[PDB]
Amino acid sequence: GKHVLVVYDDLSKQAAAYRELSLLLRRPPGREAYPGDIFYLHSRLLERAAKLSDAKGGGSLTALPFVETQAGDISAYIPTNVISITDGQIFLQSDLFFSGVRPAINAGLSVSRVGGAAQIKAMKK
Amino acid sequence: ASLRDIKTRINATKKTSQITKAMEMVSTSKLNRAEQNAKSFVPYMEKIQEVVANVAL
Known part of the structure; x- marks a missing residue:
């Protein structure tokens, strides 16, 4: 019945470690030499966060996975896999960071599907 | 460089090009x-010049 917040700091590093293990086991590689089950891995990890019904106790668990991009390439394999799973994304840009705009959330690209329901009435107003 | 930054750069340059072309098109009609x-000013000035060129003395 408690509420838990979980922060994953480098899913990219987790994926790199899993790729290393898979290549050492001589499993066939996919794109960017990643194994075929990396999306299965990440979806299995992320889907364990849920909001429980009143019959199950009413507890909840929220996850904030982290993904690092090389030169802002959000079309890479792991970034696309993580983006397609989560309910929303927050984008941070060094262009905004250096221009004095910090925290550097890019409101144009950021999305939150649960928005509105996750706000108080005055904040919605 | 990064392809994302390159595409954003190209898109911004294209938008600026469109704006400048629209400006030139407007300026052409304004000049016309x-x-x-x-030309409509010219006749009155010519008449005043031929009128005032002598009585000034």
Whole structure:
């Protein structure tokens, strides 16, 4: 019945470690030499966060996975896999960071599907 | 460089190009209309010049 917040700091590093293990086991590689089950891995990890019904106790668990991009390439394999799973994304840009705009959330690209329901009435107003 | 930054750079340059082309198109019509006003000005100035060129002395 408690509420838990979980922060994953480098899913990219987790994926790199899993790729290393898979290549050492001589499993066939996919794109960017990643194994075929990396999306299965990440979806299995992320889907364990849920909001429980009143019959199950009413507890909840929220996850904030982290993904690092090389030169802002959000079309890479792991970034696309993580983006397609989560309910929303927050984008941070060094262009905004250096221009004095910090925290550097890019409101144009950021999305939150649960928005509105996750706000108080005055904040919605 | 990064392809994302390159595409954003190209898109911004294209938008600026469109704006500047629209500006030039507008300025062309403005010049075309101003030339007629200059031509309409000419006769009155010519008459005043031929009128005041002698009585000034």
